[PDB]
Amino acid sequence: DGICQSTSNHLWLLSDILGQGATANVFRGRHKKTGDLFAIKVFNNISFLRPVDVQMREFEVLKKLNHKNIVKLFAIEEETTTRHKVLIMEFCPCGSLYTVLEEPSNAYGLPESEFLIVLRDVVGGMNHLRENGIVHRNIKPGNIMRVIGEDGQSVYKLTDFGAARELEDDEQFVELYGTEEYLHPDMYERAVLRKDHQKKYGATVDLWSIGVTFYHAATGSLPFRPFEGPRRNKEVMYKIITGKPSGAISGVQKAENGPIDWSGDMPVSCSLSRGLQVLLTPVLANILEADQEKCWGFDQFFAETSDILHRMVIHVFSLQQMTAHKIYIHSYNTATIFHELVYKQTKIISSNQELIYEGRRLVLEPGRLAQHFPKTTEENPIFVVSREPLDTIGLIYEKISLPKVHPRYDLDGDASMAKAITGVVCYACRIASTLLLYQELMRKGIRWLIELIKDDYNETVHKKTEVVITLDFCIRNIEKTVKVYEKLMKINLEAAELGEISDIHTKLLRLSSSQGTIETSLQDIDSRLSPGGSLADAWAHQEGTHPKDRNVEKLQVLLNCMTEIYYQFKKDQAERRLAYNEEQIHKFDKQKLYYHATKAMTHFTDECVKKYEAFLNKSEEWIRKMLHLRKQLLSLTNQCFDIEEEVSKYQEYTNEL
Amino acid sequence: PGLDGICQSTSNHLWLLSDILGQGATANVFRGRHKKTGDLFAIKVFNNISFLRPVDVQMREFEVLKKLNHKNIVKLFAIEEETTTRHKVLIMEFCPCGSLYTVLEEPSNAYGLPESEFLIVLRDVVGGMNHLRENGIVHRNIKPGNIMRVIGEDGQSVYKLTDFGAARELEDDEQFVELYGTEEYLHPDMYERAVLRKDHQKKYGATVDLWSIGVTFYHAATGSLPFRPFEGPRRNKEVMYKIITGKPSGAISGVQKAENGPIDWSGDMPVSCSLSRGLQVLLTPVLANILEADQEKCWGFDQFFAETSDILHRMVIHVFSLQQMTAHKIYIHSYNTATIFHELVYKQTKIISSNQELIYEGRRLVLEPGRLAQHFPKTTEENPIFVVSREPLDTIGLIYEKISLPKVHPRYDLDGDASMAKAITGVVCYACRIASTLLLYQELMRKGIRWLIELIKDDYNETVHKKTEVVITLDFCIRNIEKTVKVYEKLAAELGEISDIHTKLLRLSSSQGTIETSLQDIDSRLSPGGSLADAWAHQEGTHPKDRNVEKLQVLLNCMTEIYYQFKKDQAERRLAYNEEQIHKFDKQKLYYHATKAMTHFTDECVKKYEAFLNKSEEWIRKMLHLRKQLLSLTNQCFDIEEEVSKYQEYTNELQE
């Protein structure tokens, strides 16, 4: 099938088909004279049964769109033989967003890094649409192209404006196009069920198309799931897409014709940080609104999302809770605003937060901007510690087990099973990777904290021994005088009351045992603060996984084998028939898939999970040991200001003859 | 059985003739599967010239290899017969990742292999070679296209020896007579008897492998062969011989740079080599003794094994010289004490252990002279131990090799374009390597200067914490103790004690005043606005947010993919018409991307690095000068506290 088509300047092979639709096909072509490739869109023979009024609808829409996040329409030429108008537009090799969301890596949500890029580009393009006055009512992951930027960072772009119209900000259409799962309810009603009633829509459908897309890219799952799959139960799908209560972003049905579980929260399987979910779920619950009353406008949406995109991330790790946190804060905020963000995520008050960073405390003045903070990463975060007790939470993942392998040799039934069984092991690999970082950040901060209790202990000795000398020679300043108070004169047989300077001697000397008992009390502190003490991190290098164990690398090696089988089974499920030997290998490798998934899921729960929980217990007992010692060291620290302010007023009386 | 042209089989295995892994004069190797299981194996069938080397003496070699089981030997499972031809076939373990040669043909490794992988190669090659010597099998044929690579259970690669094509059973010392191998990795004795059809009574030992091991290691370490006669070594059959024979003692590489001209003999690694300076000083002597042509000064295996075992048994502590802007890997033994650690820092940075100050994770590092290196702080390369002296040091920076792009030849040549895309992509690979190193060095300087400045604040606070203790004694234990009871004799009593000590009290008290004058100046110089500021550090140089290395990697991937296509375009000697023009267009695209990357590398990464290097160098002066000045005040404090420590010893007399 080496047939081809060409225009005046481009040519393409019919076999080199990129995408496909009901209205046109998309090919990988080249410029005849430059060699550079473009995506060529030729319209099939059935698109010329549409009116000439409607076959220009996509042509005038793609004309008034020139922007990144919009697939660049390079030119528009006529094919040689058929004289059909075709669209020469830029070619994105990396596929669509749907191409990405099908990777088993992102089966439970995109990495939080990429999600912010999808957030950035979708809004930027969708804004450029309403800004130029076009409502593209077919926004779906298969529609959002991905191209690699000059800096390696992804850049997403919109296309496939076959479902478009010249929409004004208060105009509404009565026509029908789109794809099921990512379409507004009052367009799903008329398009799927051919049932129309009492509403027309314009510029509000896309907010729903965007919101459903964002939930998919965040959780790896569609937000509104009827049981038996979403292929049928359209009556149930509409029961969920419209009967959903305002403020709940997901509607899933567990049973067959059973309940409709509503939820306003992200699932535990989500990959995004908790600091982001609290910012994100409001946006989803307000563009996932059927009616125009309780819904958000484009004005409010673009303002709220830009607030998220215009923030910066400061990584903060709670040492008493063993929980990482991402602080989404503007660069113009203050330090006292920062403390508020940390309270909402850790439930520890602003007045209780000490900031350890790179083996040092952190001078935290409220009049300092966020951009002048020390640069933070997830591996080099700002630690936070509190002198009041906190529950050691730890990582809270979702316990996911493997699905049940089916013995029926089914080409697409094994491909669908290979996707999920690899995704489950993929999630466990991501969790074991986080469990490693949580343990390694524990070791990093505890060592920095121990070095700070030594700075707290060494600081008092420099002050206590500084008042032990202020009292050493202040007590002999009136002892060399009371020595001669009766050396030249009356016999000093015993100690009696002599004058105003006799009580400033018998009570001031009491600060030699009341303070002498502190010098011996600090020794018990320095003992437990020493290598052999009851506060050593000897267990920290003894419990839990280590990076030198390479547990994550071992899991990744099993996962590669599982992934190679899955990518093979999708080649197999294309053309649903296999030769004899090929069928047997498929059956053999199907069993190896279960072997690798079992070995992986075993090593996760037995080596990574078991030792992490063992590490979380040997650290729960050390939190109390340390927080109790800080309570004692500070009580001794405050005594050296009650002993030294007392030897201050009596220091004036002792400077005399 | 098969249809004669597409597949062969044994009783237990079968394979397609298209799934061919390797060819050879005696046999070919295919990718096959166990019949009853489906699991994969490499199948080696001996068609022709299997009868050239005797069958019984070669069959007994197979049975003893069937019992061989080691990590670094390709397992020989069973030995069977092909169904219809009845040729002997060996079933072996399949290594999907290919050979070490495939790894060295990547552009990423066009120069040094990454140090991590090189240690793996050194470990496995030595491990497998020792297993053969301990079982009495001579390889005499080892080359990169011969060392297989598999991915272990932990993702780290595991190399496995195979194709003992020159092999028989050997003792520790006897006589031989054979000829097998490939030209480049060959001992000079065999290079005459296998390339230039000329024989002599020259003898061997355990050393003929040691030369091939030496040439193979140098290749993996530098990306090039150690002996190159002007043109390709495969063309100058005579000049290549003249080099290895007259190889001077100590030299490990000879390259003829001018045609029929002199041969530049080098005794150390090229600058382009990726390996650390710490490892080079250990690897170079090993390569020297094994690349010895004559058996009189060669090493022998017992010494070669224990020597490389020492390199492998060492761990690495990462150390960054803050004043020199140089990173260092320290190959120390786990049982080695802390004292020898300082020795290794000396040999690399010229900093004696008396002025070796160590910072790690925000604080100084105290070094107990007997602490074991297996309990040092764990060090990554981005989390090293910083070393500073109070003594001046030349700020060196990173020493890389200025490698410009080759001249892209304009002629349409399927072979030339493929061989040119290899080199030019490798140059952008080396440039991207350095671009990442430069950014690390700059980010480590920022992490070090930030810590050191905070350390000087600790040294400052320690001395001002001491000044408040001698003044609370000088002004109180002397000015008050003496003025009350001692300067009131009006008659031991009134001697040089009242005259000299009262003056020295006021000598020290008045001079101590201007010590506070110089102390607040130092506090001002390391305060926010002072001459010692982190300001220029956050302003000069490239940054992670710049994403230079990512930008360079994007260009490199387009070049890499064009090269991999030109590789397949070379598989055909002739290209179809439209394919020829794509290859002609992508050739210009390949050179466009390269010059674009080299521009951004030199104008962005290099310049701002060198600009950062200067503002670094000028800050070292102002830093080292401030520490010398604060120290002089610190010793004045102890001096004043010492002078007063005995004047107070006579104020406690109190007999007047």
Binding site: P407, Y580, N581, Q584, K590 | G2, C7, L14, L16, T83
Partner: peptide, 12 residues
């Protein structure tokens, strides 16, 4: 689960 059968040289 035991559907896979031994590979055969005659299908290749």
């Amino acid at each position: 689960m035991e559907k896979p059968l031994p590979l055969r040289e005659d299908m290749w």
